[PDB]
Amino acid sequence: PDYASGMELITILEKTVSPDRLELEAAQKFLERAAVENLPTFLVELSRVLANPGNSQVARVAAGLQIKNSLTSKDPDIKAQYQQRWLAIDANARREVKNYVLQTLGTETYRPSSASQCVAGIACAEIPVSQWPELIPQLVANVTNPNSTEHMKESTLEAIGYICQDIDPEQLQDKSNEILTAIIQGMRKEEPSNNVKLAATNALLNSLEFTKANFDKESERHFIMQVVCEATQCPDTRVRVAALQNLVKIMSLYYQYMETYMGPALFAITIEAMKSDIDEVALQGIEFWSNVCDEEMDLAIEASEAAEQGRPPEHTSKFYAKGALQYLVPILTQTLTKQDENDDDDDWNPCKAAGVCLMLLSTCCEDDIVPHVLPFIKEHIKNPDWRYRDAAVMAFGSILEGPEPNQLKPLVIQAMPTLIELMKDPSVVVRDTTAWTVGRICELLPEAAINDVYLVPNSS
Amino acid sequence: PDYASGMELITILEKTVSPDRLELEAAQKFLERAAVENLPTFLVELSRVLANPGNSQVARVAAGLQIKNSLTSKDPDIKAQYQQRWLAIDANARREVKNYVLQTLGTETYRPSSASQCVAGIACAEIPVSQWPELIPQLVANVTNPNSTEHMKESTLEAIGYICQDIDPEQLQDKSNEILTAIIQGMRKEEPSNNVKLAATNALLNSLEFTKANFDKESERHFIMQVVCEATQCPDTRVRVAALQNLVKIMSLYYQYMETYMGPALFAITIEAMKSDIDEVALQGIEFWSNVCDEEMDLAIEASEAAEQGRPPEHTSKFYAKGALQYLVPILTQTLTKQDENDDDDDWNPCKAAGVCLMLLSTCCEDDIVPHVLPFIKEHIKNPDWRYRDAAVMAFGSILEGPEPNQLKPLVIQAMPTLIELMKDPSVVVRDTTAWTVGRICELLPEAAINDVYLVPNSS
C-alpha cells in the first residue's frame, strides 16, 4: 500500500476552491469519477481527511461536503436513492466512516461543523432501520461530559439539531428522553458558552415535534420552561431570539399548561420583548400574543358549539388576551409609528406585525378593544407628525372587525369627514393607509358609509 | 324480580310517555326510586325489557333511555361518576346487562336503535379498563357475517360509530384494524342496504381521529380509499355526502398520500360534486378544493422558510390547485350566479362557499387566476340578469388579493367607472356586492383608487 492515496485526494480536495477554472473543473471530474470507480472506499478515504486535524481547513470542509452530497439532495427522490445507495455499502465500510465522522466532533476549529451535517446524513438513513445503535448515547455523552470542550458540545448539539429536523418525528419519539437530556444540558443557565447555548436552543425548537410525552409530565415541563425562560435573558441576542421562538411554539402547542408560567414569567418576558428596539426580538414578542389570540379565539368557538349542544366545553380559555389588553395595546399603537418610509410593503417589520396583531386582538376581544384604542386615535388622528397621524388611521381601521357593529357605526360617522380629508393628506403613506381604512369600512360596515357618503368619479 | 314485577316495570316504562301529567310524574318517581332502591337489578331488568322483541316499541325505547341515562350525562363530571358507579356493580350483574344489550342488536324494528346507545355508554366506561374484551370481536362478527340482517349490521355499525366518537382515540388505536374491518365491510360497494352503507360511512368519519397507523400502511390505505370512492357513487345522496365528507377530511389529514388517488379518482369525483344541483353535495366538492388550497398555501410557506434557511423543504406540494385551475374556476364563477335573494342572514350555501373558494384560489395561484376570471367578468359585468351582473362584480373582487398588484391596477382603473355606476344599480344585491368589491380595492390597491375616486358626504 501507499499513502499517495490520501495525499492526492487532499490535493484535489483543495483545488475545488482554486481561483482557476481548469483545476476547479478537473478537481470535480476526478472526485465524481472516484465516486463511480469505488464509492465505499471513496467515502472511507474522505472520512479520514475530515477526521484529520492536521489537514488544512479547506481540505476538511471539502471532504465533509463530498461526504454530505453523497447522502442527501434537495430532491426528495434523489435523496431517497442516496440513502438506499448508502445502506447498500457493507456494514464494515460504514462503521469505519461513521466512527471517523463521530471522532471529528470537537476536532474542528472553523465555525460551521462539517462533521455534524455528515452525522445527520447518515443518521437519516441508518436510524430508520436501527443501524446506528450507538449514535444517540455517544451524542448525549459528548454533551453531558464535564470535560467536553466548547467545540465538542457545540458541534454535537448542531448534529442533534439537524437530526431533529431531518428525521421523521416518529423515528425519534423512541429516544426523546435521551435527546432532550442532551439538549437541556446544553441550555443550562450555567453554560459558559453562548455558542453552546444557541446550538442547544435551536435544537429544542426542532424537538418540539416529538416531545409530547415529555411536556405532558408536569415534572419535566417545569424544568424545560425554566431553562427556556432563563435563555430569554441571555446577553447574546441570537440565544434570546431562539428562546422566544420556543415560547412562541410552545404556546401554540400547550396552551392548557401555560397558566403556571403566564403570570410568573411569560407575561413579563414577552411584554418586554415587544418593547425591544431590536426587530427580531419584537417580532417574536408580537407573534407570541398573536398565537394566544388564535388559541383563545378557537376556544371561544369551542365554548359556543358546546353550549348549543347543551354541554360544557372540553377545554376553556384563561382569557390571557383580554387580561393583557391594557398593556398590549399601548405597545402596539406605538409600534405603528415605526412604519417603513418606502413602499417595501412586503417587508415584515414590527410595525406591520403590530398592525396584524391589533386586528387579531380586535376579533378576539371584540367590544373590549375599542375602549383601549379610541383614546390613541382621537389623540393622534390630527397630529402634525405623519408617523402618528398614520398610526391613528391604521389603528381605527384595525378595530372594525370584531366589535359590535352598533358600537362602530357612530365612530365611523364621526370620523368619516376626517378620513375623506385624510385622503388628500400631504403624506403618501397616510393617504394609502386612509384608503385602506375607508376600504375596511365600506367593506365591514357598508351602511355607515353608503349613507354618509356616495362615490363620485375623480378628476386628474 | 318475578314475571309480575317485570310486567309492572313495562307498564311504568310506557307511562313515561303518557299524555297525562300524574302518570308521567308517578312513572319517573318510581323509576328513579327503583334505581336508588337497587340499581344493579334495575339495570338487569331494563336490559331484559329492551332485549325482548315482544315488548312494545315505547317500552323498549324507554328502557334503553333509562339504561343510557344511568351511564352517561352531558356534564363531564356527572358522566364520570356514573361510569364509576357502573364499574362498582359486580361483574356478574354487568355481564348480564351487557349480554342483553348485545342481544338486542338486530332485534329492533324501529328506526333509531336504542341498544347501540347503551353499548356506547357501557363501552365508554369498561373499555378504558379492559372490562369488555368480547365487545369488539362480537361487533365485528355481527357485520362480517354473511347471514347478518340489515338491522343487525345497521345497529352494530351505529354502535361502532358512537364508540368511535365517545371514546378517547388512544383507547381505540389498539383495536383499529378490527373496527376498520367492520367499518369497511359495511361500506363494500356490494352492500344491499343504503342504510347499512350510511351507518358505515358515518362511522368511518369518526374513526379518522385514531386510525393514523392504518392510513400510514400503503396496503390498507388503498382499500379504504377504494371503498370511500365507491361510496361517492351510491345512488342514496346521504351515503354520497358522507363519503365526500370523508374525502374532505382525508385530504386535510393525508395530503402526502393523495398523489395516488388524485388523478385516478379524486379529481373527477370532486369536480363532478361541485357541479351538482344538490347543495349538500356541491358544498362538499367546494370544501375539498378549499382544503387543498389551504394545504398547498402552508406548503408554499414551508418551502419559503426552508429556502431562507438554506435547505430543501421537508414536504413539497404537488400543486393540485394550480393544475385544476382551468376546470375549477368556470364551475365556481357559474355557481356565483346561484346567489340566494340576499341570504336568510348569511346562510352557508354553494354561492358563498364558491366565492370564498375563488378567493383562496386567487391567493394560492395568484398571477394565473386572472386570465381565467377576467373573461367571465368582462362578459357579465353589464348583463341584464342581476344574478350574472352580481356574480361578475363578486368575481372581480375575489381576485384582488394574490395576483401581482401591477397586473390588477389597470383592471381597476378600467373598471372603476362601471363600479361607481353599479353602486347605483337597481338591484340591492348588486349594490351591496359592489360596495364590497370597491372596498376590496380601496383596501388592497389604495393607489389605484385614491387617484380615481372621490367620497362625497351625503347632504341628504
Side-chain angles (χ1 to χ4, degrees):
Chain A
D2 52 5
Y3 179 48
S5 184
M7 271 218 90
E8 186 193 7
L9 208 196
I10 299 175
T11 304
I12 293 174
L13 279 174
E14 294 187 62
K15 289 185 178 183
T16 63
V17 186
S18 169
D20 171 60
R21 188 61 191 174
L22 298 171
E23 296 187 64
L24 210 174
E25 184 165 356
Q28 189 64 56
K29 221 313 85 179
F30 168 73
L31 299 171
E32 178 175 56
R33 179 170 187 172
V36 185
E37 198 75 69
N38 183 182
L39 196 61
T41 299
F42 185 53
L43 296 181
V44 172
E45 284 298 76
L46 292 169
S47 56
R48 299 184 68 183
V49 177
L50 179 60
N52 189 184
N55 286 306
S56 58
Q57 171 169 178
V58 294
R60 311 183 70 189
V61 184
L65 184 52
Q66 288 294 318
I67 302 174
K68 172 188 171 183
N69 300 181
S70 297
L71 290 87
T72 58
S73 185
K74 301 296 193 64
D75 298 303
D77 191 288
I78 299 179
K79 171 181 169 56
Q81 54 178 294
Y82 283 178
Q83 310 183 319
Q84 299 312 307
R85 178 170 76 172
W86 165 258
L87 274 52
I89 301 178
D90 86 289
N92 284 63
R94 295 187 310 174
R95 293 192 216 67
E96 185 94 310
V97 170
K98 294 190 293 173
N99 275 306
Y100 279 158
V101 174
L102 283 195
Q103 302 309 303
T104 294
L105 300 171
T107 80
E108 311 177 77
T109 288
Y110 37 87
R111 183 78 294 178
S113 173
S114 303
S116 304
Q117 310 212 300
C118 300
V119 182
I122 298 166
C124 292
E126 312 213 331
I127 291 300
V129 196
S130 314
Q131 286 294 76
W132 205 343
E134 64 279 64
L135 172 58
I136 288 293
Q138 183 55 42
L139 300 177
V140 178
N142 290 347
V143 175
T144 41
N145 176 176
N147 296 190
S148 292
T149 71
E150 175 185 48
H151 290 281
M152 172 59 81
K153 298 191 289 186
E154 180 186 0
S155 58
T156 284
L157 282 161
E158 301 184 326
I160 288 186
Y162 297 156
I163 289 180
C164 289
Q165 71 173 174
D166 293 341
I167 292 181
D168 186 353
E170 0 290 1
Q171 302 307 299
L172 304 176
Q173 291 176 60
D174 323 306
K175 295 182 180 179
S176 82
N177 292 189
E178 287 76 66
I179 303 179
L180 251 175
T181 301
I183 292 184
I184 292 185
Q185 198 49 48
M187 295 194 250
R188 63 177 208 296
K189 170 180 180 62
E190 308 74 53
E191 231 316 304
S193 175
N194 49 130
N195 295 304
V196 172
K197 240 164 199 172
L198 179 61
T201 310
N202 279 329
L204 181 67
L205 193 61
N206 296 323
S207 85
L208 288 176
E209 298 296 72
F210 60 73
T211 59
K212 191 66 58 193
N214 293 281
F215 273 76
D216 289 308
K217 286 191 292 188
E218 173 171 54
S219 313
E220 307 194 0
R221 188 210 305 152
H222 278 298
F223 192 45
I224 300 171
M225 290 301 289
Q226 190 177 188
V227 161
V228 165
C229 285
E230 259 144 46
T232 68
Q233 298 305 285
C234 177
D236 185 329
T237 294
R238 291 166 315 157
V239 175
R240 182 188 189 179
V241 160
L244 290 173
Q245 288 177 306
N246 271 290
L247 292 182
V248 164
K249 196 170 181 182
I250 285 172
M251 169 55 86
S252 79
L253 231 40
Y254 304 105
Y255 171 99
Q256 291 303 320
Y257 296 141
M258 298 313 247
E259 189 155 46
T260 304
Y261 323 90
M262 186 59 237
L266 300 181
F267 182 70
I269 289 177
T270 60
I271 284 299
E272 186 52 47
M274 277 175 73
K275 297 209 275 191
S276 183
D277 59 301
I278 307 164
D279 285 6
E280 198 153 303
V281 169
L283 287 171
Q284 226 48 59
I286 299 173
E287 185 174 359
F288 177 84
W289 287 97
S290 286
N291 275 6
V292 174
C293 284
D294 282 340
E295 288 308 314
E296 303 194 321
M297 275 174 76
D298 281 312
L299 287 166
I301 295 174
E302 184 174 309
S304 196
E305 304 187 329
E308 292 181 355
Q309 281 167 47
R311 43 148 61 87
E314 184 181 313
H315 313 283
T316 62
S317 140
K318 308 309 176 294
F319 300 85
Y320 297 124
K322 171 177 162 48
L325 220 50
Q326 64 188 295
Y327 311 112
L328 288 177
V329 175
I331 297 170
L332 292 167
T333 41
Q334 189 54 40
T335 302
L336 287 180
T337 69
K338 327 294 184 180
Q339 61 269 74
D340 192 297
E341 186 63 62
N342 195 59
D343 277 356
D344 285 303
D345 193 61
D346 78 307
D347 192 76
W348 188 242
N349 50 50
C351 178
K352 298 179 191 170
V356 172
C357 182
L358 252 175
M359 291 176 247
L360 265 178
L361 199 57
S362 285
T363 60
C364 176
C365 297
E366 297 179 49
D367 297 296
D368 313 296
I369 180 67
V370 177
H372 291 293
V373 179
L374 269 173
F376 177 92
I377 300 174
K378 286 312 152 190
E379 185 181 318
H380 296 290
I381 190 56
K382 47 199 302 299
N383 186 311
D385 185 354
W386 66 270
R387 287 174 171 297
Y388 279 77
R389 200 160 64 254
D390 167 89
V393 181
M394 178 57 224
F396 184 75
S398 287
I399 66 176
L400 298 177
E401 170 166 42
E404 191 61 58
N406 303 58
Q407 181 188 176
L408 302 170
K409 290 163 181 173
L411 299 169
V412 182
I413 297 181
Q414 164 186 45
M416 193 60 86
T418 306
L419 299 176
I420 300 186
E421 284 179 51
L422 282 166
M423 310 245 248
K424 290 117 68 165
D425 195 277
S427 171
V428 197
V429 181
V430 171
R431 292 202 292 283
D432 288 326
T433 301
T434 304
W436 184 71
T437 298
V438 172
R440 295 268 290 173
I441 289 167
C442 226
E443 191 182 88
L444 306 158
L445 303 162
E447 287 51 58
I450 285 302
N451 314 312
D452 280 58
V453 62
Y454 62 89
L455 280 60
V456 164
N458 198 97
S459 292
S460 58
Chain B
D2 57 3
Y3 170 75
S5 56
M7 215 52 234
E8 66 170 358
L9 205 208
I10 292 170
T11 311
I12 294 290
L13 290 168
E14 301 185 308
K15 291 188 175 185
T16 61
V17 185
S18 183
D20 185 303
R21 175 50 190 182
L22 291 175
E23 271 176 46
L24 196 162
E25 187 185 13
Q28 192 62 69
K29 293 289 184 181
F30 176 72
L31 296 176
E32 172 180 54
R33 162 137 36 67
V36 169
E37 198 178 307
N38 183 47
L39 187 55
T41 296
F42 181 52
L43 293 182
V44 175
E45 281 298 72
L46 290 162
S47 60
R48 292 186 62 221
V49 165
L50 173 66
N52 184 181
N55 281 319
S56 83
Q57 181 176 298
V58 164
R60 299 181 75 191
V61 166
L65 185 55
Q66 282 295 318
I67 297 178
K68 175 176 169 291
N69 296 165
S70 294
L71 310 193
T72 316
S73 173
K74 285 296 192 61
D75 181 3
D77 300 66
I78 289 180
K79 162 179 169 283
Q81 50 173 286
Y82 284 179
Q83 303 175 315
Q84 295 302 301
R85 177 177 64 189
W86 164 268
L87 288 181
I89 301 170
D90 79 301
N92 298 304
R94 288 184 303 189
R95 296 202 202 71
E96 184 155 27
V97 169
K98 290 188 285 187
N99 269 295
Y100 279 127
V101 174
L102 286 187
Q103 288 166 44
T104 314
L105 292 177
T107 74
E108 308 170 87
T109 287
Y110 44 90
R111 178 72 294 172
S113 169
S114 287
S116 58
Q117 308 209 312
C118 293
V119 175
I122 300 171
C124 291
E126 305 210 322
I127 274 175
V129 295
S130 178
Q131 271 288 63
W132 205 353
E134 47 293 294
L135 171 56
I136 294 305
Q138 184 50 53
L139 297 184
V140 173
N142 291 39
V143 187
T144 54
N145 201 90
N147 282 178
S148 304
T149 176
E150 166 175 43
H151 293 303
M152 168 67 110
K153 287 170 304 191
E154 182 176 6
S155 59
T156 310
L157 286 158
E158 304 189 321
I160 298 177
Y162 290 140
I163 296 180
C164 287
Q165 54 166 167
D166 281 288
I167 273 187
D168 219 9
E170 358 299 352
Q171 299 300 326
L172 295 172
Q173 294 185 57
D174 326 296
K175 324 179 177 186
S176 52
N177 285 177
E178 278 292 58
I179 295 173
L180 265 182
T181 286
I183 288 176
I184 293 180
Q185 187 52 46
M187 291 187 269
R188 276 182 166 279
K189 85 176 181 182
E190 19 283 347
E191 238 307 306
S193 175
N194 281 348
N195 296 320
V196 173
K197 275 176 177 177
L198 181 43
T201 299
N202 277 348
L204 174 56
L205 191 46
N206 299 148
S207 74
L208 296 182
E209 291 289 87
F210 66 73
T211 45
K212 226 196 78 62
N214 303 301
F215 270 78
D216 290 326
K217 299 177 300 185
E218 167 198 66
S219 191
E220 177 150 47
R221 186 202 309 151
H222 164 224
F223 206 61
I224 301 186
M225 294 309 278
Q226 173 192 169
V227 176
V228 177
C229 291
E230 296 181 303
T232 64
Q233 301 312 303
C234 174
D236 185 297
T237 296
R238 305 169 300 165
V239 175
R240 183 184 185 185
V241 174
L244 294 176
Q245 284 180 292
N246 275 292
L247 292 187
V248 172
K249 187 70 174 62
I250 291 165
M251 173 52 66
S252 63
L253 235 47
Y254 304 108
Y255 177 81
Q256 294 298 305
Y257 296 150
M258 299 302 99
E259 184 169 48
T260 317
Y261 330 94
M262 183 56 88
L266 302 193
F267 178 86
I269 288 165
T270 65
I271 286 298
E272 185 54 47
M274 287 186 50
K275 271 180 275 195
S276 182
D277 281 325
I278 300 171
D279 281 40
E280 198 46 65
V281 169
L283 283 172
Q284 233 50 59
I286 295 170
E287 189 170 347
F288 181 87
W289 286 98
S290 289
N291 274 24
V292 171
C293 283
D294 284 327
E295 276 302 304
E296 312 198 312
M297 279 174 74
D298 289 331
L299 290 163
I301 294 178
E302 191 175 312
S304 139
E305 305 172 324
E308 290 176 351
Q309 79 182 324
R311 65 123 53 60
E314 37 180 50
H315 299 289
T316 63
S317 61
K318 318 309 170 188
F319 301 89
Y320 300 121
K322 172 182 166 59
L325 225 56
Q326 63 171 79
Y327 308 87
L328 286 172
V329 177
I331 304 175
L332 294 170
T333 64
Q334 176 56 45
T335 300
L336 291 177
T337 65
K338 305 302 172 182
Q339 64 269 83
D340 175 299
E341 303 203 304
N342 210 173
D343 54 53
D344 297 294
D345 291 343
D346 290 300
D347 298 304
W348 185 250
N349 45 41
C351 180
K352 195 175 290 62
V356 182
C357 186
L358 266 176
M359 293 191 260
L360 281 182
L361 222 35
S362 297
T363 64
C364 188
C365 295
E366 298 179 359
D367 43 306
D368 300 328
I369 191 157
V370 183
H372 298 283
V373 191
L374 276 182
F376 179 85
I377 300 177
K378 301 187 179 181
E379 179 179 309
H380 303 292
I381 181 74
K382 48 178 295 302
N383 191 307
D385 188 358
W386 72 269
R387 282 177 165 292
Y388 276 68
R389 193 161 62 275
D390 179 35
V393 177
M394 177 62 221
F396 187 58
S398 293
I399 68 173
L400 300 181
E401 179 172 18
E404 196 168 308
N406 274 53
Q407 190 187 183
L408 288 171
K409 296 177 189 175
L411 298 167
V412 173
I413 295 177
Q414 175 180 57
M416 194 56 81
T418 306
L419 297 173
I420 304 174
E421 282 180 47
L422 285 169
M423 286 281 13
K424 291 104 72 174
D425 190 280
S427 174
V428 187
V429 181
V430 175
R431 261 178 285 126
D432 298 313
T433 296
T434 307
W436 180 82
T437 299
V438 183
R440 292 274 287 169
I441 301 175
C442 260
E443 204 178 78
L444 297 151
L445 297 162
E447 283 301 303
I450 282 188
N451 302 305
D452 282 310
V453 85
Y454 271 131
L455 270 68
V456 184
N458 247 50
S459 296
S460 62

